[PDB]
C-alpha cells in the first residue's frame, strides 16, 4: 500500500543520487547530488509515520552508502555527514537492522577517523554507544 510505495520511492531516489555522484566522481564531473538533496531527503527520513516502513525496506543501506567514502577515497561534504548522523539518532534502530545493513561499520569509522571534525566524531561516538545497547538487550 501507500506507506511502502512511499518508502520504496525514497529508497530508489537515494540510490539513484548515490550512483550518479559516484559515477561523476570517477569521471571527474561535479558530484553534487547528495549535497543538493540532503536537506529535503533528510526531512523525509525524519518522518515518524514513515520510519518503520523505511527501516523494513532497508533504508539503512542507502544511508550507509551516502556516508561512505567516494570512489577516490574522499569523504562526502560535512553537511551530509552531520545531517545523516542526526537522522540516524532519531530512528528506532535495533539489532536486526544493524546486522543486515552494516551501517554501524561506517558510523564506527566516523567515531575513530582522525581527519573527522571533533563534533562529528563525538556525534558518531554517541550513536555507537547507543547502538551498543542492542548488543546487551
Amino acid at each position: 500500500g501507500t506507506v511502502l510505495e512511499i518508502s520504496r520511492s525514497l529508497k530508489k531516489r537515494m540510490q539513484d543520487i548515490l550512483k550518479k555522484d559516484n559515477a561523476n566522481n570517477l569521471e571527474g564531473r561535479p558530484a553534487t547530488g547528495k549535497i543538493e538533496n540532503v536537506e529535503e531527503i533528510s526531512d523525509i527520513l525524519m518522518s515518524k509515520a514513515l520510519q518503520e516502513s523505511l527501516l523494513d525496506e532497508g533504508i539503512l543501506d542507502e544511508i550507509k552508502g551516502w556516508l561512505e567514502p567516494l570512489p577516490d577515497k574522499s569523504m562526502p561534504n560535512i553537511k551530509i555527514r552531520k545531517r545523516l548522523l542526526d537522522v540516524l539518532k532519531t530512528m528506532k534502530i535495533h539489532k536486526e537492522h544493524l546486522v543486515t545493513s552494516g551501517v554501524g561499520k561506517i558510523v564506527y569509522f566516523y567515531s575513530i577517523n582522525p581527519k573527522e571534525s571533533k563534533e562529528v566524531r563525538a556525534s558518531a561516538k554517541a550513536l555507537v554507544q547507543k547502538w551498543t545497547n542492542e548488543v546487551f538487550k
Binding site: K73, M75, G102, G104, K105, Y108, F109, N113, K115
Partner: peptide, 24 residues
C-alpha cells in the same frame, strides 16, 4: 553474561574497525 558471545554480536554490527582504514 557470556561476554565472548556479546563481543561476537558486537563484531557482527560494528566489524573490527578495518572496513574503511584504506581511507587513511
Amino acid at each position: 553474561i557470556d561476554y565472548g558471545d556479546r563481543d561476537s554480536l558486537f563484531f557482527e554490527i560494528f566489524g573490527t574497525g578495518e572496513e574503511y582504514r584504506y581511507v587513511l
